[PDB]
Symmetry: C2
Amino acid sequence: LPHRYPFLLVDKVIPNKTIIGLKQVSTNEPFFNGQIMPGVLQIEALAQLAGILCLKSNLFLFAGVDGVRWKKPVLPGDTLTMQANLISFKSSLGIAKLSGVGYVNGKVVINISEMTFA
Amino acid sequence: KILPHRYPFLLVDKVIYMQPNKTIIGLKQVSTNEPFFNGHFPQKQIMPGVLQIEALAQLAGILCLKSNLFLFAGVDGVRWKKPVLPGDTLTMQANLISFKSAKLSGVGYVNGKVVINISEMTFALS
């Protein structure tokens, strides 16, 4: 699974339709260097999940993204629950469009209408 | 010269122009020793498209600030055209779109060539 971002943000994943995975945030969190999980890192988190699907459905690059809304911040001790649903995969152009959601104890912390990969 | 930031790192080295409630133009020098790079060695360190909307979001707020707390709420139409590498100078610009009692657009270039587009960044209050 290709990521231009250094650390993988999916602790574990729990075809051609949908994926679910987890990520417990902690005090460790190698994502900075020396406290909350920035919204753009949540965008990165869902986007790595999506590709795990795409890869189980052949190189692919996160091309774009739209429809992102961060409802609540993600804090240390929070278990992020992520789901990405496949929308279309036209090999015609080679474009895939996923949709993503993030939960924190059953609540929505971040929505994503569409994530493009090519 | 610092003001509030969501992310731990300021992704704007210098603002080179600004006209309140309208537009601004900052710039960032991609170092070989940046946090988001430290995480693997010699090969092809490429600045994450995601840390690009942050840099631009940080820049977009400094405009909201110069135009009350601004919380980066959401984002639409982000297209990553070109990869940003170390040594490149990312030239950013964001334009106020609305202040509904906030929204701005942002563009990032490298040597006059567009490397990333954001149709809209949404910032809430408090």
